[PDB]
Design a protein around this ligand. Structure first.
Ligand SMILES: OC[C@H]1O[C@H](O[C@H]2O[C@H](CO)[C@@H](O)[C@H](O)[C@H]2O)[C@H](O)[C@@H](O)[C@@H]1O
Lengths: 393, 443, 271, 284, 393
């Protein structure tokens, strides 16, 4: 309902673990802003600092200028959904929903009226009199959301409420959450770990890492312009194919020929501090078989030949890992992004290409492909930011 | 080690109130035996009403280790009928039935024979005296009303004003009530226990009412002991020796306690520690044991902050009739060494161990000869008063159901402060009748 | 950091005081010399170990601590042995009457011990085991074995039984599984039920007081209940206090040693 | 199926057999003795009476006084123990600086001998030497009056048997996930409506089981009464009654009827707690 | 490693409940056969029967030609991996995986050596000394793999090994699983439920339903030619879009006209007894926006318009949710599956169009549908089987 102001709020421990360092951001009214980031990068820390369940190290959080650093969570008029469903087994679902209304000392008749309304919004009419044991995981999640909505708080604080269910239920309830929020038009601070969730719903996405919000922008904006290399490797599914090269006055020295760049992008990459090596990134949907594309694309595309070692029918498209002539990418910040999964660089020199399943090139058969050159993701040697964007101020 | 085999060990069961003296007695007796066997003392609880409980539990549970028991002076008429405490008549040596009556006093001996047959040998006797602080009071009361008058007088002067009597729900209260009742010309049961003779005769009713009125007038008086209804022998003796009381009624064993506890420190109004002539005059185990003149020193010193006098009467005309008490030695029925036990009994009570217990444990001996010795008369100054009080003493009913009657009495007199004479006197009769008929269930 | 720290400090020092005052009191009594023992000074003055000296001089407490310890061990051994063979059968099998069995094992644990002393006395006086170790071990199982069944049945239900099928799928000999995989998964439960039953053995006074006579079978709570002081004429308060301290320190240090297992056992699984 | 059947019928065979032989046999023996004029002093002459041993108890007075004292002690002590044990389990569960220390402190009274504690409380209320007795108005001596002595007994009982109940309650408490407490706090739990609205109705089975233990254990109170007062002055529980009428009166024929009646009444208590209130075993 | 031939295995539950019905299949060697299906469809049931944990009433099964209807699990020499990870906490990692070798009465030296080697296969030599508790869940799965590899059995039963892991973890780990199985050529049965793992690792994917093996074979055969509605729905991301229609001998009478297809399909339909109702199915990947692709291929396609309700931005592709004025998809085989979804009848016949990013269809606007004429299949609502494929007895 009301914008949420941040005044250099940080989370640091006297035991040494600093969770947040002086973040400042205002959550617009009604926007479906979503927090995304790796595990323990400060997401839950920020969320519980908002909810007052976590003590703020320093800084000031304001709900449109209201002193809430010392405010009790019961006196902030907020609501939230816990991924553990935070359900009371002893009381029925009707009593579950009515509980915060009961605490509100409202009229029991209008309390039951509001419960009936919000349940019919969620179609839980025959479940309100049941026990959580008598319900399904989706039903329990719906119960949690209904318990969170009836309060009409200043803001919603959701915490991956669909993380622990089936994928189809996940996506359909995700659409339903989008619909419910937009109909209700209230501020919601959604916290999660997957990027696709935000990409399908977020009116704006904020990537979090170790107390640093690397970027504040819209899902399409994060998709088109990775503000750095960490967001490039983290946002997108799968990540864009990474290629190493060194600086060139007309482009980059690609392992498959010389890549030329436009004058404007050449100027902007020159405007950045000159790196010794450049990190090139291209998304698998860009790299396509040249045997099916027109020559009008190839005037700017650098065509080359490549053999494949991984073949599969992945439906309409084929994510095709190929034995390519491209060495491993090296950068001072790429190391901290490498050990995330464990089998890192074992399939290096073999990158993936999202191509339609119509082609029948199998393993051993070298197929000549081509992709646009301007679709590269450029990164500095020390900053790793997208050098197609000038260094801000 | 591993297997410590030895001869017979006759087990001797004496109350804990006088354990350390009968232990030394057993030590002295384990010399006149050589290697035939030894005696081992074992302690019973300090209260009379539970000493019987322990003994009866052991006797009925066939505890084959119980050999010799020192039982109270009111239990023979019960242990004899119940089969326990086998009679003197069947000592395989044939010596107890005439060793018991050799030199015993005529009073205590009458408490052993039940149906003219002896079942135990008297080892000691008792009778209460009046102990006072002669520096505070002068000319001790010699009457209960005078006792209370002196108590009030001392309380008005802000002095120790407790009377320090035994008033718990045990047997020490029934003993006191019986003393008062009989000294007022009454009696609980008939001469033979057949029907309660407490409140049938108007004279008897007047006597029991006077006794109840004295009991109530004490324990409800200015400056009385607050916890008067929880006191017994040890508590009264200690509360006197601390200095909280200036009068007390207690058995003669309090004199040895006075002297020993004063020499060992304790008693503040009688230091007896700053006298180097008393150095080393405490045995390595605790007992006093003066040499021959350390006693004279520590006794002439105490003779001016301590003193005794005969029991206070009820009416100023007639004297009192103090209730007799003591211990008898008997041989349990659950004994396999039924000869060594009868030997150790007669070896426990003789003209040296009696002298020892009376001169270092306060317990009045029972050998009528000792009270005519000059030296024994010089180390046991209350001998004359004890002899006098034992002449016209007032024995207890001595019926098989006695200890079931004393429980009812103590139960209906349990809170002394909550006594009113006229109803409590008429209420005692129903309980005595029930105890005679063995009806209901005791508390 | 600022509020909560001092809040919890001053809140949980209250419970320390609560728990330690009735013990520090008697311990201070136990050190006062026999003269000043009658003043209400909570903190003593010119303490003396004479009371403990008089307690050690003697053999009444050794020959009772030994009886208590031995009876505790001999009781808990057979209790755990006969109770594990039931708890395992009650947590894994479905015989007709299970709920009745567990309800009985729950109820009989807190049996009214007065309903036993009359027939037990009337029996043991007539069979021969009046004052003996078995004469005490036999009634004590009425409280040991139900407690052992209850505790071990609570603990066994926390065993990942699927490991049985696991071993059946990568090995052989269901007996070898029962021997090698669940036995290490069931040793700590026995080690903890033993401590619980042993500790529970000590807190009995009625039966050990009404079925024991002499030094051969008197336990510790009975030994201290009948104590009256070292000497016969001195004030008995300090001596009784010292005797109590000496008779109670062993089980106290035992409980302090095994605190973790104890709290993990009583709170079945939790903590 | 038959395999596990005949396996259980052989594993719970020795346990059940020993339990029967050592519990149901003395109870039947007591019931059969409860019909005779069996006296310890006169063993050879015992006659089958009938019901002449329950008449003389139900019509007596010391029976009802002891029963009433036992019920009052049980109710009051159990209520106070429940309150203190809950307030203590909370501290033992949510403390922050030292938890091992508070756990050790709580266990100290749990493992102590139940008689040395009674000696401590006995010497604390003795005038002159008792630091508690020296606080009352002078010349109080509360160990002689009936009701103050009962109060002292209740205090000792509470102090001794709180830790056990607090651990029993912390058992059912540690299964309350903290996320529920946080959700309540967010929704507006006053930190009291929290307790009375989510925590208590969630740990009801553990509460009822702890209540059953404490009731059946305080109904057999023998030790604190035996040490502090000894049962004199009408402050004697129903156990003191049997222990006295068996060893001081030697009457087995009714010292056993007392045991039978005590068994029947604790069975009634158990029936109440089981049928009503549930009180099911933790195994479900 | 050894062939596994099923033959009409049948049950007798004490309850009489039917969990199996005449299963016959040769689980070939070197292949990675996958049993996929919903709850209670028999996957776990038949897997236990493979392990011999559940006993048959009648039927036959042979590994290496010999009957195993009575052979003990300790005897058949098959390694199974458990979703509970079946880890012994009292044994260290190297001991935990050496346990079956010590059971098999092998040599301490070669046992320890083979343990070291099989750990190198899973890189567990780094933590061979630890306890199962003090390592992560993925590492617990790795220890399960360690216990699996060592004994070199005749077959593998990797029952839902990826149930508790995360998406990226599970995809990389199932790639590892497939390549390791190929490295060992072991006959596996990957009893799972997710369709991704099912179709990306299966050489002959076998689907189940209430004890009936609907369609058995390569993922591609089921994917293009679903035998009936159960596989058509349970397989697909999203499932094939079902359109009810009326019977026609020259085409099919759709609620929006007749679809002009080749007549031999109508002959195949007429080969069977005439059904009463029919449903038409086209996967979302076949439908495109005619505002981007001309009517070239749509010359034979039956074109009409649908009201779009929701639109999804995916990046490389675009998804739109659209409901039309067509009857609700009602089928006897779909009605048996109605108990699964939970949010019913809100978006019936609301389908999605798998269209690339360049399609910019507005929300709410009724737009025509572009799709290949032959990419739709004919299956009657009565028999549920795909009438595109003839009924073979
Ligand atoms: O003189 C010390 C003895 O005093 C108690 O015994 C006396 O008091 C009893 C009732 O108070 C009488 O029954 C008994 O006859 C008296 O001797 C104490 O019970 C004894 O243990 C002491 O030795």
């Amino acid at each position: 309902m009301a914008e949420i102001v941040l005044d250099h709020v940080n989370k640091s421990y006297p035991d040494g673990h600093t969770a947040v360092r002086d973040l400042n951001l205002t959550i617009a009214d009604g926007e479906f802003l979503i927090l995304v980031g790796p595990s323990g990068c400060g997401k839950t820390t920020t969320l519980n600092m908002i909810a007052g369940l976590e003590d703020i190290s320093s800084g000031e959080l304001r709900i449109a200028g209201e002193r809430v650093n010392e405010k009790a969570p019961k006196d902030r008029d907020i609501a939230m959904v816990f991924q553990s469903y935070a359900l009371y087994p002893h009381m029925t679902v009707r009593q579950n929903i009515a509980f915060p209304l009961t605490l509100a000392k409202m009229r029991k008749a209008d309390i039951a009226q509001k419960v009936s309304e919000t349940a019919k919004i969620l179609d839980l009419t025959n479940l309100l009199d049941r026990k959580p044991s008598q319900l399904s995981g989706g039903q329990r999640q719906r119960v949690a959301m209904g318990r969170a909505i009836v309060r009409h708080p200043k803001a919603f604080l959701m915490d991956e409420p669909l993380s622990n269910l089936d994928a189809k239920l996940r996506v359909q309830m995700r659409g339903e959450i989008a619909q419910l929020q937009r109909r209700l038009g209230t501020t919601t601070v959604y916290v999660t770990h997957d990027q696709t969730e935000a990409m399908t719903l977020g009116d704006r996405v904020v990537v979090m890492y170790g107390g640093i919000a690397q970027q504040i922008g819209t899902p399409e904006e994060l998709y088109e312009r990775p503000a750095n290399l960490f967001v490039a490797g983290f946002i997108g599914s799968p990540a864009m194919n990474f290629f190493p090269a060194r600086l060139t006055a007309i482009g980059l020295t690609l392992p498959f020929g010389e890549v030329t760049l436009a004058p404007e992008v050449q100027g902007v990459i020159a405007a950045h501090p000159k790196p010794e090596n450049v990190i090139v990134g291209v998304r698998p949907e860009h790299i396509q078989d040249a045997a099916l594309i027109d020559a009008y694309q190839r005037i700017r595309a650098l065509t080359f030949q490549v053999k494949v070692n991984l073949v599969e029918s992945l439906g309409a498209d084929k994510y095709l890992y190929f034995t390519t002539e491209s060495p491993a990418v090296h950068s001072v910040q790429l190391d901290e992004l490498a050990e995330v999964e464990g089998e890192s660089a074992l399939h290096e020199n073999q990158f993936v290409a999202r191509v339609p399943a119509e082609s029948k090139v199998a393993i051993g058969q070298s197929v000549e492909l081509a992709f646009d050159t301007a679709r590269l993701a450029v990164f500095d040697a020390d900053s790793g930011a997208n050098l197609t964007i000038p260094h801000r101020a | 080690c591993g297997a410590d085999s030895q001869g017979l060990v006759v087990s001797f069961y004496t109350p804990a109130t006088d354990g350390a003296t009968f232990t030394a007695i057993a030590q002295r007796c384990n010399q006149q035996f050589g290697g035939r066997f030894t005696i081992a003392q074992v302690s019973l609880p300090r209260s009379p009403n539970e000493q019987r409980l322990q003994l009866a539990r052991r006797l009925t549970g066939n505890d084959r280790t119980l050999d010799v028991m020192a039982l109270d002076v009111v239990w023979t008429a019960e242990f004899a009928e119940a089969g326990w405490a086998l009679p003197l008549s069947d000592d395989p040596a044939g010596l107890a039935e005439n060793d018991a009556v050799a030199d015993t006093l005529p009073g205590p001996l009458a408490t052993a024979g039940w149906n003219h047959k002896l079942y135990a040998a008297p080892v000691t006797t008792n009778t209460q005296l009046l102990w006072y602080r002669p520096d505070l009071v002068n000319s001790p009361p010699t009457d209960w009303n005078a006792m209370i008058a002196e108590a009030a007088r001392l309380h008005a002067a802000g002095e120790p004003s407790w009377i320090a009597v035994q008033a718990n729900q045990g047997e020490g209260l029934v003993v006191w009530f019986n003393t008062l009742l009989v000294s007022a010309g009454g009696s609980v049961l008939s001469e033979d226990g057949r029907h309660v003779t407490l409140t049938d005769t108007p004279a008897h009713r007047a006597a029991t009412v006077s006794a109840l009125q004295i009991l109530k007038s004490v324990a409800t008086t200015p400056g009385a002991d607050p916890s008067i209804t929880r006191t017994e022998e040890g508590s009264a003796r200690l509360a006197f020796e601390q200095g909280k009381a200036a009068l007390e009624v207690n058995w003669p064993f309090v004199f040895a306690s006075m002297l020993e506890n004063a020499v060992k420190g304790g008693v503040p109004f009688l230091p007896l520690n700053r006298i180097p002539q008393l150095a080393g005059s405490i045995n390595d185990i605790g007992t006093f044991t003066p040499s021959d003149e350390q006693f004279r020193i520590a006794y002439d010193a105490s003779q001016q902050v301590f003193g005794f006098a005969p029991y206070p009467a009820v009416a100023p005309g007639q004297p009192a009739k103090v209730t007799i008490g003591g211990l008898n030695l008997a041989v349990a029925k659950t004994t396999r060494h039924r000869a060594e036990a009868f030997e150790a009994v007669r070896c426990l009570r003789d003209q040296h161990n009696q002298r020892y217990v009376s001169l270092e444990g306060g317990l009045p001996a029972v050998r009528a000869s000792l009270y005519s010795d000059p030296q024994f008369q010089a180390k046991y100054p209350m001998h004359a008063i004890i002899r006098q009080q034992l002449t016209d003493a007032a024995v207890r009913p001595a019926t098989p159901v006695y200890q079931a009657l004393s429980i009812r009495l103590a139960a209906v007199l349990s809170p002394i402060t909550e006594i009113d004479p006229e109803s409590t006197a008429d209420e005692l009769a129903a309980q005595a009748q029930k105890a005679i008929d063995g009806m209901g269930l005791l508390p | 950091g600022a509020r909560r720290a001092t809040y919890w400090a001053v809140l949980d020092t209250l419970v320390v005081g609560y728990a330690l005052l009735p013990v520090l009191w008697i311990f201070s009594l136990s050190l006062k010399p026999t003269s000043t023992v009658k003043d209400g000074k909570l903190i003593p003055s010119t303490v003396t170990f004479d009371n403990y000296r008089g307690i050690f001089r003697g053999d009444l407490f050794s020959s009772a601590l030994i009886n208590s310890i031995g009876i505790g061990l001999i009781t808990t051994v057979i209790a755990v042995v006969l109770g594990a063979m039931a708890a395992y059968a009650v947590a894994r099998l479905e015989f007709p009457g299970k709920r009745l069995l567990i309800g009985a094992a729950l109820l009989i644990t807190m049996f009214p011990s007065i309903s036993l002393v009359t027939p037990l006395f009337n029996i043991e006086r007539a069979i021969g085991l009046f004052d003996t170790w078995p004469g005490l071990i036999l009634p004590y199982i009425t409280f040991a074995l139900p407690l052992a069944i209850y505790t071990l049945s609570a603990f066994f239900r926390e065993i990942p039984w699927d490991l049985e099928k696991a071993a059946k799928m990568d090995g052989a000999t269901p007996g070898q599984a029962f021997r090698k995989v669940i036995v290490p998964l069931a040793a700590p439960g026995l080690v903890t039920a033993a401590i619980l039953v042993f500790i529970f053995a000590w807190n009995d006074l009625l039966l050990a007081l009404s079925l024991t006579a002499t030094k051969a079978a008197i336990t510790a709570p009975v030994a201290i209940a009948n104590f009256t002081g070292s000497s016969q004429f001195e004030e008995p308060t300090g001596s009784i206090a010292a005797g109590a301290i000496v008779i109670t320190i062993p089980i106290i240090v035992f409980v302090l040693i095994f605190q973790r297992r104890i709290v993990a056992g009583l709170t079945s699984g939790a903590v | 199926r038959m395999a596990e059947r005949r396996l259980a019928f052989m594993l719970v065979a020795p346990a059940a057999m020993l339990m029967v032989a050592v519990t149901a046999y003395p109870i039947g023996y007591a019931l059969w003795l409860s019909l005779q004029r069996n006296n310890l002093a006169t063993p050879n002459d015992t006659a089958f009476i009938g019901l002449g041993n329950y008449h003389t108890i139900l019509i007596d007075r010391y029976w009802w006084t002891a029963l009433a004292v036992t019920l009052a002690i049980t109710a009051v002590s159990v209520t106070i123990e429940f309150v203190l044990g809950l307030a203590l389990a909370l501290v033992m569960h949510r403390t922050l600086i030292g938890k091992g220390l508070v756990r050790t402190a709580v266990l100290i009274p749990y493992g102590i001998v139940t008689v040395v504690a009674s000696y401590s409380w006995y010497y604390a209320w003795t005038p002159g030497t008792g630091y508690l007795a020296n606080l009352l108005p002078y010349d109080s001596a509360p160990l002689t009056q009936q009701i103050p002595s009962l109060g002292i007994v209740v205090i000792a009982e509470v102090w001794k048997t709180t830790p056990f109940m607090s651990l029993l309650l912390l058992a059912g408490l540690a299964l309350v996930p903290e996320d529920l407490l946080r959700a309540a706090q967010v929704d507006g739990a006053s930190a009291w409506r929290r307790l009375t609205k989510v925590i208590l109705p969630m740990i009801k089975p553990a509460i009822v089981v702890a209540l059953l233990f404490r009731t059946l254990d305080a109904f057999r109170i023998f030790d604190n009464i035996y040490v502090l007062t000894g049962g004199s002055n009408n402050t004697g529980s129903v156990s003191i009654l049997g222990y006295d009428n068996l060893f001081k009166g030697f009457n087995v024929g009714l010292g056993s009827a007392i045991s039978v009646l005590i068994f029947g009444c604790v069975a009634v208590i158990a029936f109440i707690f089981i049928k009503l209130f549930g009180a099911a075993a933790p195994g479900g």
